[PDB]
Amino acid sequence: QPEPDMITIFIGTWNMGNAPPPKKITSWFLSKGQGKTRDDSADYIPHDIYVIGTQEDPLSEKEWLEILKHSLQEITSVTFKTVAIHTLWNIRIVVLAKPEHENRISHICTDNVKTGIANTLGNKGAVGVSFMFNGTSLGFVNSHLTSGSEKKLRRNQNYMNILRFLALGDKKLSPFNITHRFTHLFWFGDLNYRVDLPTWEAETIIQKIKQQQYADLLSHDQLLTERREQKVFLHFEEEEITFAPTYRFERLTRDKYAYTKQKATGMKYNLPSWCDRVLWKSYPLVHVVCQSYGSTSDIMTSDHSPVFATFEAGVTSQFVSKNGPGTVDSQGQIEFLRCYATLKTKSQTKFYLEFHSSCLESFVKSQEGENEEGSEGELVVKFGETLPKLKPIISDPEYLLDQHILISIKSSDSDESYGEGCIALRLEATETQLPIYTPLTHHGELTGHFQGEIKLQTSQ
Numbered sequence: 368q369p370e371p372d373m374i375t376i377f378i379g380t381w382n383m384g385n386a387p388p389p390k391k392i393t394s395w396f397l398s399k400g401q402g403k404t405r406d407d408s409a410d411y412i413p414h415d416i417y418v419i420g421t422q423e424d425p426l427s428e429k430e431w432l433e434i435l436k437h438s439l440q441e442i443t444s445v446t447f448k449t450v451a452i453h454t455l456w457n458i459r460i461v462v463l464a465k466p467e468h469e470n471r472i473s474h475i476c477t478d479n480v481k482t483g484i485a486n487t488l489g490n491k492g493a494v495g496v497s498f499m500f501n502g503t504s505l506g507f508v509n510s511h512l513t514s515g516s517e518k519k520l521r522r523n524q525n526y527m528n529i530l531r532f533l534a535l536g537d538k539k540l541s542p543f544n545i546t547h548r549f550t551h552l553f554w555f556g557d558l559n560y561r562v563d564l565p566t567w568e569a570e571t572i573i574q575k576i577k578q579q580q581y582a583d584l585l586s587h588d589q590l591l592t593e594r595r596e597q598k599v600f601l602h603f604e605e606e607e608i609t610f611a612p613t614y615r616f617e618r619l620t621r622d623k624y625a626y627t628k629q630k631a632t633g634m635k636y637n638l639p640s641w642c643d644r645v646l647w648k649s650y651p652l653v654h655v656v657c658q659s660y661g662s663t664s665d666i667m668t669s670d671h672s673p674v675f676a677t678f679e680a681g682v683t684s685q686f687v688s689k690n691g692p693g694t695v696d697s698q699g700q701i702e703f704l705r706c707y708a709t710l711k712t713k714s715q716t717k718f719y720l721e722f723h724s725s726c727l728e729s730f731v732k733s734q735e736g737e738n739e740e741g742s743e744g745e746l747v748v749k750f751g752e753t754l755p756k757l758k759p760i761i762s763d764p765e766y767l768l769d770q771h772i773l774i775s776i777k778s779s780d781s782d783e784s785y786g787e788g789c790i791a792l793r794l795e796a797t798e799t800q801l802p803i804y805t806p807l808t809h810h811g812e813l814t815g816h817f818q819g820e821i822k823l824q825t826s827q
């Protein structure tokens with residue numbers, strides 16, 4: 368039985384509007400409805416992993432697991448295994464996998480973050496799941512962010528609290544938040560960003576939707592515009608949206624958007640919006656292709672429509688050589704030449720680097736770099752040719768070229784990370800000096816850059 372080098376992952380997000388689902392929800396798992404939909408010829412082919420995010424979910428974990436498993440069994444004739452289920456209030460994540468993957472999945476983690484303080488603490492936040500699939504780390508975040516058209520900044524703050532405080536993945540990666548811990552990170556949910564047009568334009572917006580003319584609406588989508596201005600979701604991707612806004616519908620039809628202010632809305636308008644989203648971030652030069660992104664048309668119990676996304680994702684095998692794991696492979700080495708970090712910090716402390724990777728027996732601390740002043744005010748930390756030679760556990764190029772090195776730049780004074788990034792070892796050549804680059808972030812905000820050259824030696 369050969370180990371896979373690709374899997375397909377289903378991501379679903381649905382705000383259920385505190386109503387039980389209808390008897391049939393198979394269209395969701397089949398990526399059928401509006402948008403980028405899945406070919407009919409694939410309907411019987413199971414995805415490898417299904418990740419279901421709900422919000423305003425009124426069901427018990429048991430009730431929802433029974434509907435999900437029976438749904439997938441009807442579609443695929445496969446009885447899926449439950450990897451994980453985690454619920455915060457009415458926010459839930461379920462991870463299901465094909466039975467053949469049971470002994471490929473390990474290190475399962477779950478966590479939640481509650482957003483807001485006092486007033487604003489009590490129903491919004493996120494749940495997450497991570498695990499290893501053979502040699503590949505996978506993370507999944509289902510978030511229900513702050514509602515309301517005039518709260519995009521709150522949403523962006525909820526995002527930063529969730530990425531700072533959701534504790535998933537390998538805890539040995541202590542300098543790194545969830546945006547660096549996984550080969551593939553999927554973030555989805557009722558993110559609650561709105562189409563930011565005047566209230567008086569509600570019927571115009573509805574007209575545009577009925578004509579399937581989304582361009583003038585998406586140019587005012589707060590998630591796209593906030594992302595464009597680097598206010599939120601920096602270094603994440605989203606597929607092009609080609610489906611109608613998924614909120615706010617009259618229940619039991621999809622023929623009507625209910626946008627007018629009501630006591631039940633706190634006298635807020637809910638102009639038609641793409642509240643329900645799927646985004647991802649994968650390490651550099653790993654295969655990840657979105658194969659569907661859309662909304663269902665036939666599930667109408669909620670004032671939101673379910674959203675689906677599917678992905679091809681590269682995975683690697685759990686590699687064993689004669690040498691590592693449990694020792695170094697002297698035929699392998701990673702060298703760094705002419706490296707420097709450019710930091711936005713106004714501070715003057717010394718800095719050192721930490722290199723973290725599952726290709727190393729443990730993380731490596733560098734010597735302190737030399738601080739200089741950039742021509743436009745910046746701090747430049749020069750490492751020159753001073754960085755340590757990294758000793759991988761396995762030298763086989765079939766393993767080593769698939770790996771990644773996480774970098775943190777840390778203050779000598781405080782041992783606090785000022786910036787985190789990631790370098791792919793998927794190089795154009797071995798035994799050859801080649802440029803490398805990563806942006807550096809801290810709490811998911813840009814703090815600098817790391818650049819230089821790498822020289823990778825494999826056994827070939």
Ligand SMILES: CN1CCN(c2ccc(C#N)cc2)CC1
Nearest residue numbers: 585586591592594595596603604
């Ligand atoms: C690195 N890429 C991902 C983020 N980018 C964008 C572009 C347009 C909008 C809009 N509207 C939002 C984000 C640039 C390309």
